[PDB]
Design a protein around this ligand. Structure first.
Ligand SMILES: [Cu+2]
Ligand SMILES: [Cu+2]
Lengths: 620, 620
């Protein structure tokens, strides 16, 4: 019944049939993206209309199309031919990955480079990586991937231990031709293996860990209705899944007495970029837009009970489309569970004699994705006290290079001859806000120091100040950890019982933003990553901070274009875009497989409630 | 056997007997502090001499003494008379807190002030607070507490809901004299109650929370020997307890194959200050040194199984002295347990076909203290991967005032007429480092941005810079979140297999430090709180960042005086002092009892190991 229900296998098969009968899905076509469209703004929309957006690639070289389909009515709503030299290429297809290694395997320049290094071509794996936009004019309007080589000594070997440095190739994956092979010199291929399941490397496994058993003998405290609607401890929300963004949270609201109060209309990780900081020409082009170029949802893991998710777990198994329009189920792709989170509130009072302790809990909604060597977990948390938190967990295997004789200012040494280039992992959270409704505003809050003097004779006073962001041209903000800077999203038309506007406060981790030179290609294509906070006026088609077609787009799309409209955001329907990320100087302990590191943000109520919202939590 | 064992009841009784025999503990004497001294530097020199340090107060007004005794040999080692007007008063005694309300109940100035407000003296509670050092010359050399008043409507009422603003009194607790009563005008006493167990306020309790059962069917994975020596998942340490500092960690080490490798010799929270930012003369003197003035270990809670600590819990019950030298057990005052901590490492490799997931866990050592309206939890965490983390949890009831008509720049409104002054909670961690032994140094590490140009033609390169701190005069450092600043403690004489010095990296939360004006009394007394990081050369008598005697002591002691010696810290026995804190602008949701907020820091290995230290963790 809900317009926010997950796509079903039958809906995807119907989309396939509609495209096929319209002549839009011949043997030369590939679906590069397929997703449900959210309902348009309308708090009275009753007519059910399930619409899907599709990007259609053509392997023979014809121009791609963007198509919108109505599943409800069985019709094609619109079909537009795309000029990719202008607006960007379509996302990378899974089937184009293996093409890169196959094409190089018969190219005489590639084979010459391997022969000089005494490498068997059958043992050389090629990582197929997005191309970006640099100095090569012949690439404009063509689908390019670039390849970096790794040696796999045997089928179960970790090829990441054996980078082949000084060599890179560029490939047109539609015309199937190798455009350039660049060989800058011979580097020894690091020889130590990185096989973290080899007993020779692990040593004897520990026998000292005793079981931890986490059970819920009466079942979990949340309910799931209509497939993806969650009710838990006064929270209400819908769990969506999109092949580009992954898990998406809709209609986050809190039941305060008899009122269901909205907080966030839609929450997602709308882009993530991994720029590398090694100036070697072998890698200086390397920037992963994992969301926009690769689509993190289609690489979601199936999560195993007792290993990936521990406790009383409820799974969702979302459905996506393959390249031909067939539905594909990601079995156990989303984990949902509640967990204990320590003490919530505690006080032992001498005067009243009352001793009071209550425990906290959080609801967890998570998925894990694998893109090449990296693995990322995406975690959303809801807490009893109204706090909302996101956490990204980074693990997997670091991307490697040779470690140069004489050292490097831009590469860490992990093992003899083995390097790991410096890089960042930067995320953009898109928060379509709805604090008690859609009339919202953002204030920047700084601590204010005061000078000792009249009215402050002991020099102890301090204060704070709030600045309203009133137009998009002034809503591009930087962090300032030294002044305790936070941002408050409030509703100026909804007051608490003290006659103050209700609000939520965003707490950032204040990690460094994009480090690349402002004039670089990556600073232009990932402009969102250069600032901590952006606020835009809501619009239906402003979905991603990097624009719709990120792959090989020359730059400036997404947030810089949106902000340029300079719309009023003071008490309007607004969207907060928060940049946060990890700056990774790899350490020896990250090798041969990296322990998790984390980054995130949280939002806490700020006068949203009339008092603490967890006074009705029992003692148990 | 171990020199680091907890003080026993018998040792405390023996100290009492030794002091009595020496003529130092007659009926007019009180013990204000008693604690065991750590062994001096010298690997097992003293065979074992258990020594105790005692501060002895005299209720008749004679000068106090600092005494060191050997319980092993039954002797007083030294006894020194203290000149408290010069070097500071002793910590506040529990029995002095009761004196204040009773003395005020008979003072005609106090009664006249209450009669002016139509208040019944029998219902007025007085919060007795430390005095600090301000403009009152008659206080020098005297033990003073200051009192603020709150109305308790009935014996189970939360008096914090009913502050009596505009009124403060100062009391000499030795001569039993009210020195001053200051009345700046009548404020209405806020009338709403704050009784968070009253069903009228809580509403009906939730019935929705289902149980979460955490058990360990085979028992925990750690062992406890010698009363307080812990071994868990390659970690080794001793858990101490001091009445001033609370839980102290000694001899933190990691078993790396065959070798027990030291990391931290002694870790503690060596001071904590809570400065208030309201310039009203009723409260502009208000600063709590909870550790230095009150002694946080003395007020440790007994922790209840299932409420305070959940899971398979091992308890320690430390012994302290009462004011007469009798032993007092804090039953179940320390909780120890291990917790699941999600995914440790994960990778699904396309090329090798191997899927790999491992789970993390952490060892938790915690205690909770209650001082007046505030309750603080202190948590130390050890992780499988070598990470050490500290977390403070702040809860309890916020300190209140009237809310002025016309508002305030320094006070939050919580309820009609009820305010909460702005304040901070600032901690000092004292980390006596021993990274692979005692030859250590500290480097400051900043991210370095690079300009596009020769050798960085695409503008993507970034790097980092490390600066060795070589002398104490240059070892007073501030945070810089924007450049990703961290600090590395390394051993220049101990190298990993890549021939790089082994190290640990300190990651701060980069919260604001002390906000008070630099010329204020509190900035001079809490100078440590004005900077994020200090490094000193180890010395036996340099224990607290505020000095030995904080109560009513002007500046002149502690970290600024230590640093002036300008000692060599480049490859020496060094101590890291890290300042971290919360800046608290109270919100409506903090009333009537505050949900936990947290702050802390962590240390992560940085080339300490030759590869990931958790390759031998089994799959389970
Ligand atoms: Cu990384
Ligand atoms: Cu506070």
């Amino acid at each position: 019944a809900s317009p926010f229900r997950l796509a079903s296998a039958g809906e995807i098969s119907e989309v396939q049939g509609i495209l096929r009968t319209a002549g839009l899905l011949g043997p030369e076509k590939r679906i590069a993206y397929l997703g449900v469209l959210d309902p348009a703004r309308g708090a009275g929309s009753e007519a059910e209309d399930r619409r899907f957006r599709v990007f259609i690639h053509d392997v023979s070289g014809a121009r791609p199309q963007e198509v919108t389909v109505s599943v409800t009515n069985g019709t094609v709503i619109s079909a537009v031919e795309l000029d990719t030299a202008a607006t960007g290429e379509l996302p990378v297809l899974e089937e184009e990955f293996e093409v890169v290694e196959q094409l190089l395997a018969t190219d005489e320049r590639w084979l010459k480079a391997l022969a000089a290094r005494n490498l068997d071509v059958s043992k050389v794996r090629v990582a197929p990586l997005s191309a970006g936009v640099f100095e090569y004019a012949e690439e404009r309007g063509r689908r390019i991937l670039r390849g970096l080589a790794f040696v796999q000594d045997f089928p179960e070997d970790s090829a990441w231990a054996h980078p082949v440095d000084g060599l890179v190739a560029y490939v047109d994956v539609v015309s199937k031709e190798v455009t350039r092979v660049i060989d800058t010199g011979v580097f020894p291929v690091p020889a130590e293996h990185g096989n973290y399941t080899d007993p020779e490397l692990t040593g004897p496994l520990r026998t000292t860990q005793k079981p931890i058993s986490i059970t819920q003998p009466e079942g979990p405290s949340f309910t799931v209705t209509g497939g993806n609607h969650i009710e838990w401890e006064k929270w209400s929300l819908d769990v969506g899944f999109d092949v580009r963004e992954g898990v998406v949270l809709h209609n986050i609201a809190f039941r305060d007495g008899d009122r269901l109060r909205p907080i966030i209309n839609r929450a997602s990780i709308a882009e993530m970029v991994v720029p590398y900081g090694d100036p070697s020409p072998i890698r200086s082009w390397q920037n992963y837009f994992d969301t926009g170029e690769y689509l993190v949802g289609q690489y979601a893991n199936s999560l195993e009970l007792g290993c990936d998710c521990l406790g009383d777990i409820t799974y969702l198994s979302p459905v996506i489309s393959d390249a031909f329009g067939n539905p594909r189920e990601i079995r156990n792709g989303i984990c949902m569970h509640e967990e204990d989170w320590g003490i919530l509130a505690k006080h032992s009072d001498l005067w009243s004699g009352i001793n009071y302790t209550r425990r906290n809990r959080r609801m967890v909604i998570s998925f894990f994705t694998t893109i090449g060597n990296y693995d990322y977990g995406f975690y959303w948390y809801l807490y009893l006290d109204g706090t909302i938190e996101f956490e990204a967990k980074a693990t997997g295997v670091v991307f490697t290079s040779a470690f140069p004789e004489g050292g490097s200012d831009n590469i860490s040494q992990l093992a003899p001859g083995l390097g790991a280039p410096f890089h960042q992992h930067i995320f953009s959270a898109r928060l379509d806000m709805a604090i008690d409704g859609f009339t919202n505003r953002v204030e920047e809050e700084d601590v204010v120091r005061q000078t000792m003097g009249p009215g402050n004779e002991r020099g102890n006073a301090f204060s704070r100040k709030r600045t309203v962001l009133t137009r998009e041209s002034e809503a591009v903000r930087e962090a300032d950890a030294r002044t305790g800077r936070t941002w408050i999203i409030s509703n100026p038309e909804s007051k608490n019982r003290l006659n103050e506007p209700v609000g939520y406060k965003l707490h950032a981790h204040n990690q460094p933003t994009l480090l690349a030179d402002p004039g670089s290609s990556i600073a232009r294509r990932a402009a969102f990553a250069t600032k901590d906070l952006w606020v835009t006026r809501y619009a239906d088609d402003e979905r991603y901070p990097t624009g719709d077609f990120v792959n090989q787009h020359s730059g400036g799309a997404g947030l810089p274009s949106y902000i340029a409209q300079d719309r009023d955001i003071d008490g309007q329907d607004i969207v907060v875009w928060h940049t946060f990320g990890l700056t990774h100087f790899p350490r020896v302990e990250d090798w041969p497989i990296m322990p998790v590191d984390t980054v995130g943000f949280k939002l806490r109520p700020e006068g949203f409630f009339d008092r603490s919202p967890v006074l009705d939590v029992p003692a148990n």
